[PDB]
Design a protein around this ligand. Structure first.
Ligand SMILES: [Zn+2]
Ligand SMILES: [Zn+2]
Ligand SMILES: [Zn+2]
Ligand SMILES: [Zn+2]
Lengths: 137, 135
RNA sequence: GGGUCUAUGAUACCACCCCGGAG
RNA sequence: GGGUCUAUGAUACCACCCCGGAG
């Protein structure tokens, strides 16, 4: 019966030039999943500005559905609906707003609702950048 | 009598201050297989912070040591300064002839030097055909 | 993201530090 | 040294181009 589901997790891997990858879903409809499950992701489904991709291990929230080939992402964002980070293989020019992740402005000029602090490197809500285990690789 | 050789930097550990040279020429004779020659940062003819980049072209004097072969003085082709590792980038204008920061090519005290590959300092090719830059 | 690295000698695998309504 | 890379959908394995001139 349910066609549209909520999930959360991290990017498992993303091939930047092929424009696709997989998400490791660690929570489905707000329930922890152990073992995690793979959810397919296409670049067209990434909520972010400009060139779309994911960096390995970045924290994500998404809607998904069952497809003929498995589980397919509908819309992928960072925690709280913010923009995804993207791969370090395609660096971008501008600074990112610490509140929404947008390129336009800084957090003091942000018109968006207040967001919790997220790791500047992987967007995880559980740690800050100085203690990032992903950055420490 | 000190020995003369030529080759490339095999590898250089920037923070350990040492590496090895791959000697492909000894006393004007081609060596195949090449032989490793130890190199310490103190023996590099270059200004400021001393290191080598992997694959850069070298000319050197060396001697036999208890541990193997040891560099006495290492330079780029024709006695010019070594390049050094991209891990420690330097700032400032370089002389187009010798690579010094002190002056410009017109004021250079070294004889006129042939064109050397911008990437590895080889006298045998230019940067557009550099096999080292290829990867 | 930002900063400072002029000295680990023998086949290594690349130093240290700072930054969370902040630029 | 300089420039360009906004579209390869299902467990992949990461695109190129220009410059030998001179302070
Ligand atoms: Zn914002
Ligand atoms: Zn993190
Ligand atoms: Zn000169
Ligand atoms: Zn070359």
């Amino acid at each position: 019966e349910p066609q549209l589901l909520h999930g959360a997790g991290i990017c498992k891997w993303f091939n930047v030039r092929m424009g696709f990858g997989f998400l490791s879903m660690t929570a489905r409809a707000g329930v922890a999943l152990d073992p995690p499950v793979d959810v397919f992701v296409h670049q067209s489904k990434l909520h972010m500005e400009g060139f779309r991709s994911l960096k390995e291990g970045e924290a994500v929230e998404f809607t998904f559905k069952k497809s003929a080939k498995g589980l397919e992402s509908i819309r992928v964002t960072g925690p709280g609906g913010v923009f995804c980070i993207g791969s370090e293989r395609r660096p971008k020019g501008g600074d990112r707003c610490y509140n929404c992740g947008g390129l336009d402005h800084h957090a003091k000029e942000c018109k968006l609702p207040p967001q919790p602090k997220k790791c500047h490197f992987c967007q995880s809500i559980n740690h800050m950048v100085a203690s990032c285990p992903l950055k420490a690789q």
